[PDB]
Enzyme design. Structure first.
Site, PDB file in Angstrom:
ATOM      1  N   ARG D  99      39.654  44.023  43.737  1.00  0.00           N
ATOM      2  CA  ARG D  99      40.794  44.615  43.024  1.00  0.00           C
ATOM      3  C   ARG D  99      41.989  44.999  43.898  1.00  0.00           C
ATOM      4  NH1 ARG D  99      36.618  49.382  43.490  1.00  0.00           N
ATOM      5  NH2 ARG D  99      36.975  50.269  41.390  1.00  0.00           N
ATOM      6  N   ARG D 106      47.694  40.062  45.207  1.00  0.00           N
ATOM      7  CA  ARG D 106      46.685  39.823  44.166  1.00  0.00           C
ATOM      8  C   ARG D 106      46.240  38.383  44.428  1.00  0.00           C
ATOM      9  NH1 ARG D 106      48.359  41.785  38.557  1.00  0.00           N
ATOM     10  NH2 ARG D 106      46.621  43.298  38.660  1.00  0.00           N
ATOM     11  N   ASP D 166      49.062  41.505  28.824  1.00  0.00           N
ATOM     12  CA  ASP D 166      50.484  41.306  29.137  1.00  0.00           C
ATOM     13  C   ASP D 166      51.181  41.745  27.848  1.00  0.00           C
ATOM     14  OD1 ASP D 166      51.158  40.598  31.780  1.00  0.00           O
ATOM     15  OD2 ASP D 166      50.785  38.569  31.442  1.00  0.00           O
ATOM     16  N   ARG D 169      51.023  45.648  26.210  1.00  0.00           N
ATOM     17  CA  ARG D 169      51.792  46.681  26.920  1.00  0.00           C
ATOM     18  C   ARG D 169      53.246  46.377  26.560  1.00  0.00           C
ATOM     19  NH1 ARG D 169      48.012  46.383  31.865  1.00  0.00           N
ATOM     20  NH2 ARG D 169      49.463  44.675  32.414  1.00  0.00           N
ATOM     21  N   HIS D 193      49.710  36.360  34.144  1.00  0.00           N
ATOM     22  CA  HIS D 193      49.179  37.667  34.555  1.00  0.00           C
ATOM     23  C   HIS D 193      49.549  38.424  35.832  1.00  0.00           C
ATOM     24  CE1 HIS D 193      46.158  40.544  33.196  1.00  0.00           C
ATOM     25  NE2 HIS D 193      45.813  40.743  34.449  1.00  0.00           N
ATOM     26  N   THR D 227      64.163  45.169  32.723  1.00  0.00           N
ATOM     27  CA  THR D 227      63.174  46.156  33.181  1.00  0.00           C
ATOM     28  C   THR D 227      61.883  46.139  32.361  1.00  0.00           C
ATOM     29  OG1 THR D 227      65.094  47.349  33.784  1.00  0.00           O
ATOM     30  CG2 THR D 227      63.040  48.604  33.818  1.00  0.00           C
TER      31      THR D 227
HETATM   32  N1  LIG Z   1      41.514  38.823  34.675  1.00  0.00           N
HETATM   33  C1  LIG Z   1      42.119  39.783  34.182  1.00  0.00           C
HETATM   34  O1  LIG Z   1      42.885  39.719  33.172  1.00  0.00           O
HETATM   35  C2  LIG Z   1      41.851  41.209  34.622  1.00  0.00           C
HETATM   36  C3  LIG Z   1      42.298  42.450  33.873  1.00  0.00           C
HETATM   37  C4  LIG Z   1      41.656  43.656  34.459  1.00  0.00           C
HETATM   38  C5  LIG Z   1      40.977  43.688  35.576  1.00  0.00           C
HETATM   39  N2  LIG Z   1      40.581  42.514  36.211  1.00  0.00           N
HETATM   40  C6  LIG Z   1      39.649  42.123  37.411  1.00  0.00           C
HETATM   41  O2  LIG Z   1      38.543  42.989  37.250  1.00  0.00           O
HETATM   42  C7  LIG Z   1      38.457  43.856  38.408  1.00  0.00           C
HETATM   43  C8  LIG Z   1      37.790  45.246  38.042  1.00  0.00           C
HETATM   44  O3  LIG Z   1      37.977  46.165  39.087  1.00  0.00           O
HETATM   45  P1  LIG Z   1      37.174  47.557  38.925  1.00  0.00           P
HETATM   46  O4  LIG Z   1      37.858  48.512  39.859  1.00  0.00           O
HETATM   47  O5  LIG Z   1      37.213  47.988  37.620  1.00  0.00           O
HETATM   48  O6  LIG Z   1      35.722  47.352  39.481  1.00  0.00           O
HETATM   49  P2  LIG Z   1      34.999  46.746  40.823  1.00  0.00           P
HETATM   50  O7  LIG Z   1      35.768  45.563  41.352  1.00  0.00           O
HETATM   51  O8  LIG Z   1      34.964  47.717  42.062  1.00  0.00           O
HETATM   52  O9  LIG Z   1      33.492  46.286  40.512  1.00  0.00           O
HETATM   53  C9  LIG Z   1      33.351  44.830  40.487  1.00  0.00           C
HETATM   54  C10 LIG Z   1      31.993  44.549  39.733  1.00  0.00           C
HETATM   55  O10 LIG Z   1      31.988  43.071  39.406  1.00  0.00           O
HETATM   56  C11 LIG Z   1      30.618  42.684  39.283  1.00  0.00           C
HETATM   57  N3  LIG Z   1      30.448  41.589  40.411  1.00  0.00           N
HETATM   58  C12 LIG Z   1      31.022  41.602  41.627  1.00  0.00           C
HETATM   59  N4  LIG Z   1      30.418  40.699  42.415  1.00  0.00           N
HETATM   60  C13 LIG Z   1      29.527  40.015  41.634  1.00  0.00           C
HETATM   61  C14 LIG Z   1      28.560  38.979  41.838  1.00  0.00           C
HETATM   62  N5  LIG Z   1      28.506  38.291  42.989  1.00  0.00           N
HETATM   63  N6  LIG Z   1      27.698  38.696  40.776  1.00  0.00           N
HETATM   64  C15 LIG Z   1      27.839  39.334  39.635  1.00  0.00           C
HETATM   65  N7  LIG Z   1      28.668  40.317  39.340  1.00  0.00           N
HETATM   66  C16 LIG Z   1      29.444  40.649  40.393  1.00  0.00           C
HETATM   67  C17 LIG Z   1      29.803  43.933  39.556  1.00  0.00           C
HETATM   68  O11 LIG Z   1      29.582  44.513  38.224  1.00  0.00           O
HETATM   69  C18 LIG Z   1      30.658  44.770  40.410  1.00  0.00           C
HETATM   70  O12 LIG Z   1      30.252  46.104  40.563  1.00  0.00           O
HETATM   71  C19 LIG Z   1      39.935  43.916  39.000  1.00  0.00           C
HETATM   72  O13 LIG Z   1      40.043  44.330  40.244  1.00  0.00           O
HETATM   73  C20 LIG Z   1      40.239  42.393  38.782  1.00  0.00           C
HETATM   74  O14 LIG Z   1      39.550  41.558  39.658  1.00  0.00           O
HETATM   75  C21 LIG Z   1      41.086  41.292  35.730  1.00  0.00           C
END
Ligand SMILES: NC(=O)c1ccc[n+]([C@@H]2O[C@H](COP(=O)([O-])OP(=O)(O)OC[C@H]3O[C@@H](n4cnc5c(N)ncnc54)[C@H](O)[C@@H]3O)[C@@H](O)[C@H]2O)c1
Ligand SMILES: NC(=O)c1ccc[n+]([C@@H]2O[C@H](COP(=O)([O-])OP(=O)(O)OC[C@H]3O[C@@H](n4cnc5c(N)ncnc54)[C@H](O)[C@@H]3O)[C@@H](O)[C@H]2O)c1
Ligand SMILES: NC(=O)c1ccc[n+]([C@@H]2O[C@H](COP(=O)([O-])OP(=O)(O)OC[C@H]3O[C@@H](n4cnc5c(N)ncnc54)[C@H](O)[C@@H]3O)[C@@H](O)[C@H]2O)c1
Ligand SMILES: NC(=O)c1ccc[n+]([C@@H]2O[C@H](COP(=O)([O-])OP(=O)(O)OC[C@H]3O[C@@H](n4cnc5c(N)ncnc54)[C@H](O)[C@@H]3O)[C@@H](O)[C@H]2O)c1
Lengths: 329, 329, 329, 329
Positions: D99, D106, D166, D169, D193, D227
């Site tokens: 994250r 990113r 997107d 919000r 995104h 903005t």
């Molecule tokens: N794609 C999108 O639209 C979108 C929107 C929101 C958030 N996100 C993504 O989701 C993340 C969530 O971050 P957070 O802070 O909430 O939590 P976090 O990143 O600290 O926890 C990640 C979790 O992903 C799973 N994971 C990681 N490695 C894995 C593996 N090898 N096998 C299986 N599962 C595994 C586990 O549940 C792990 O604890 C963001 O940082 C980003 O990558 C993406």
């Protein structure tokens, strides 16, 4: 001696019984029953009120439905014939007896209607000082006015019922040809609720793209976009080979939906057109007004109606008023 | 000049802005966030209130969640650090910082807790005159009292949070062995929320048939019905190999559930045991009280606790009070 | 040329149209319409099926309701008179014409009923090989058997409808005297669905405490606990001063509820009593069976019925079978 | 000997245990936990699957949440680290660890990401032959492709996650200035995104009236419509003064919403742009595709993007591909 009692004791506090959210229904039956089924299973009012001059039905109605009472959760459902029970309701709606007979003359319904509807007025208003009124009764637009001027609650709290479903069926029939559904397929038809209701196809689009554009132009030829509408008007007609309507009940439910909760969304209904297009003489008809908590969030949304359509709306008002004029108040 | 304006006009009526149903949250985070996720997606309050001394988080919290704001429908979500925003709420709940560290001493949490919790008191009560308080904060039972006597709102309007989940996990683990689920499998455990919580297995049944009966008698041997309970107590412990609880959030949601809506159901919580069993000195602990509209429907349900169990409940009160006595008010 | 088309293109993939979750209804009308209103607004089946020998009604029915189609979200609603449409449904239910006329003889309904019901059989079974059948039709218990043995789908997939509501009204009327509601007030009445249905008051309790206990003993005197039941039986009777039942529709909805979703809860219904109490000759009546995914989770719950009650249940079977015996198959 | 047994017997039928509707989650935590909270309380899958290489958390996660298990109704929730459990799921979604850290990059997330994500591939695909994949993991658009080409399930069944929120919000911030809300205020922003996501304001309207029209023209001056968008991009940034996102969880829930149920609505996501605008080389990014039952209802919706906007979308693809090119497969 205290059976129920000994199992269930009280505390030294005692915030006496009361309530909060109220719903009142006039005309235990189809429209009503359907509404009730909708609003009662959907979940809204703390307690609901039903009231008619049909002692029998109501018993069976209020009682049996009450039966399910347990399949969901409301609290209390009341019945009677003295508009005493409700005393203080937010979401109030009326219908009454006078439904179309295959053949037309929905407007005829004007004479034979005010008779009963009128009196209903003093009753429902006196006790529901802080209530908003929705009329599923025939002549969505028309009847609305009668009571309103009659009662004279500041607009925003008075809603007819009119063109709600108009759209949906229109929006709905719409998705069939598309392969997407009423949901995203946002299609608008606004007027007053009877064969002739102007349609504003210029507002035809999907996603973020305007339709007409995609196809270009329109009805006068085409593949009968014309038809789509008419049997929106016609819609009423055939169905009653079933006798009437027994479940457009959702529309009404949705309509008050915004109200009770108080969210401010844009939906059809019947208000006052006095200083807009041609109409200038209180022509309560089908038009966007935005609704909310014990009021129609005082906003009627203005848009540029193509002339073809433009006049159509003005038109309605013209043809519509004919009937009131007579008055028979 | 009037962009938003020209698209959206008003009416001559004007029932000014306001609202109706209110929700306030203390402690934007796990318990809170979880609650929020639960209550906010479930749908209850017209507008919700969040308030902390963590400017940052709240922004991100209130803002992002607000984000989804659109995936469901509420209206408004407010944040700040001056308990000014809410002024007049029905469903108010607090938590605070002070969670178990694998090792025990949940009770220790008493000293380090009143520090912050105390002050919260004058604030939350002054503005929520007509509000009921639910405490997800540690020591469901214990802390409850502090604020209550502190504030002194008539019981029925004050709810701790205590033994709600107790049951569920108990009821739940239960269905596993049965082949039916928490639903019909109604199993009761009532106390105060910490290892030692008495269990009233005598109230073990399914459908319309009492359990013990089916098997006969009980724990002292058997296949460890004993265990079932303990790790209900233990439940807390292990999990935090995850750090804490991030979603028992339903229980709290359910608890207020009855309240906000005002339905009168029978559920655990923490009240005042003063003239019941042995306990005679205001021992706000885990016990059935029935809840409703801005009050705990003033009824605490009396049942015949087997002696084994009987004393157990009395017991709790005894062991429980130790901690208050010290006072440190 | 490609209007709808140019706005909406496809991909090179192409997982052709299909579906998943199915609902089929027999008898577009009250029971049906009510069911439909319940199941259709509640949200369950991907697509729903309605089918009758009343071309007209169905049009109006399927069409108008479809109208609301847009107030919630299902997908597709089908109609016809050739049991061809459904081909492959999970939740199938039937009713038919033959309702009580104030005066009794619900049993009479046996002769005049098999006539039409019989034929329905070959149709509904042939195409719904993987479907479970719920009968809202009169003689919950009775009719059930006919089709079953007729069709011969392994029990668990066949459900009558019988004593579902029995309870609710019983449970419900119950909360009135209590000051709590159908919810927690769990009260049981199990039999077959007609005046005489045995009641097992021995299963009267609240929370975790058994009732009889609280009061002690019972009916033969008392304040007429006796009555409570009878007009549960009587319930049917008066109401039809309204003509019939137009919305117990929830019960049926709930019944299949467990099914469609497949959760395993304990509820009334009609199964086979062959090696239980006295009854020993396939007496499909009102009894707890537990339901789930395309089957009644093969479990009928055994409980110790007081003798007074005990025989009562046996009794029913006895009195009940009289009618079949004649056969007229 | 047969305690559970004697209370609950079976029938001679026996349709063995099984199930139907499946949900699988990768990454028990924020995004995951939030999703879970959303999808699990909303109600969808017969049984849900959670799977990680964090034995501990999952226990606490699966277990505690399971706790509430009883506050709603699902059936079963499974956990493990061998992608064996799910074997056959419809709604599958992945996230993973990586994250944003206040500061940007990113995209950097590309290198450090494929490491773990790659392997996940063989596992999740082998057992979920009939499953569709939604990626909440960073780089909605980007990562999507990797697995897809990697796995190679026919498009329609593969969904990234990208530009869902997107809009919301954007749509949401929108209603604030209006006095109506995300609901009717339909506002579109489509890209991939991340800061730079093109916006198609030309699709700004309310009701049946197009916005730009009402105001006329646009950004280059104005009151910074500019903005609005940017901090839609920026949105990500600040919040993490909270550390990350803990509940956009709705968007993902909504996204699959259409899927699981199979309704055909128009929503953002990431697909393949190969023969559209400039982009011609598989640039899986943020774009309308319509979703349904185990597939993205094979339809990507075409609209006329103003040139200003027009190129913007093309643009994205251009800037986007940079990162893949390197490959590091
Ligand atoms: N794609 C999108 O639209 C979108 C929107 C929101 C958030 N996100 C993504 O989701 C993340 C969530 O971050 P957070 O802070 O909430 O939590 P976090 O990143 O600290 O926890 C990640 C979790 O992903 C799973 N994971 C990681 N490695 C894995 C593996 N090898 N096998 C299986 N599962 C595994 C586990 O549940 C792990 O604890 C963001 O940082 C980003 O990558 C993406
Ligand atoms: N306004 C609209 O948008 C709209 C849409 C649907 C239907 N409707 C109206 O609703 C009607 C419903 O027809 P139906 O066939 O379903 O049922 P119905 O007309 O046969 O029954 C009418 C019922 O209205 C109530 N009512 C009548 N007189 C009343 C009085 N004096 N006091 C109180 N309540 C009284 C009673 O519940 C009565 O049984 C239509 O015919 C039409 O008038 C209007
Ligand atoms: N009472 C119960 O039944 C029950 C059940 C679950 C959890 N809990 C309690 O809830 C806690 C939640 O722990 P967590 O790990 O999820 O989060 P956390 O303890 O780390 O975060 C506590 C949060 O409480 C709020 N808070 C703290 N101090 C406050 C103050 N002075 N003013 C206003 N708000 C303040 C803030 O939102 C703060 O971030 C547990 O440790 C326990 O105390 C209680
Ligand atoms: N079993 C139970 O628990 C229970 C509870 C409620 C009501 N009911 C039964 O449901 C009935 C409903 O009565 P009502 O007044 O609401 O409506 P109704 O009896 O007047 O309408 C019966 C409808 O059944 C369907 N039907 C009848 N013949 C059929 C055939 N040959 N093929 C297919 N469908 C056919 C049609 O939709 C028809 O219009 C009651 O009279 C009773 O038989 C049973």
């Amino acid at each position: 001696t205290a059976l129920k009692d000994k199992l269930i004791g009280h505390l030294a506090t005692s915030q006496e019984p009361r309530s909060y959210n109220k719903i009142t229904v006039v005309g235990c039956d189809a429209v009503g029953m359907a509404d009730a089924i909708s609003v009662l299973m959907k979940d809204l009012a703390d307690e609901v009120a039903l009231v008619d001059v049909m002692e029998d039905k109501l018993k069976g109605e209020m009682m049996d439905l009450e039966h399910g009472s347990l399949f969901l959760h409301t609290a209390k459902i009341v019945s009677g014939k003295d508009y005493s029970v409700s005393a203080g309701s937010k979401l109030v709606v009326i219908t009454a007896g006078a439904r179309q007979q295959e053949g037309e003359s929905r407007l005829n319904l004007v004479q034979r209607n005010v008779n009963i509807f009128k009196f209903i007025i003093p009753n429902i208003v006196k006790h529901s000082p802080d209530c908003l009124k929705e009329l599923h009764p025939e002549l969505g637009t028309d009847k609305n006015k009668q009571d309103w001027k009659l009662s004279g609650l500041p607009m925003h709290r008075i809603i007819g019922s009119g063109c709600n479903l108009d759209s949906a069926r229109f929006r709905y029939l719409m998705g069939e040809r598309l392969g997407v559904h009423s949901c995203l397929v946002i299609g608008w038809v606004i007027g007053q609720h009877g064969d002739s209701v102007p349609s504003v196809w210029s507002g035809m689009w999907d996603a973020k793209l305007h339709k007409d554009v995609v196809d270009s132009a329109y009805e006068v030829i085409k593949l009968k976009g014309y038809t789509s509408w008419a049997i929106g008007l016609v819609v009423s007609n055939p169905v009653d080979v079933l006798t009437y309507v027994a479940w457009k009940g959702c529309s009404v439910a949705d309509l008050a939906q915004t109200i009770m909760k108080d969210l401010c969304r844009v939906h059809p209904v019947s208000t006052m057109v006095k200083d807009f297009y041609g109409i200038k003489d209180n022509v309560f008809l089908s038009l966007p007004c935005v609704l909310n908590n014990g009021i129609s969030h005082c906003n009627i949304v203005k848009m540029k109606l193509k002339p073809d359509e433009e006049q159509q709306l003005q038109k309605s008002a013209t043809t519509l008023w004919d009937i009131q004029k007579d008055l028979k108040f």
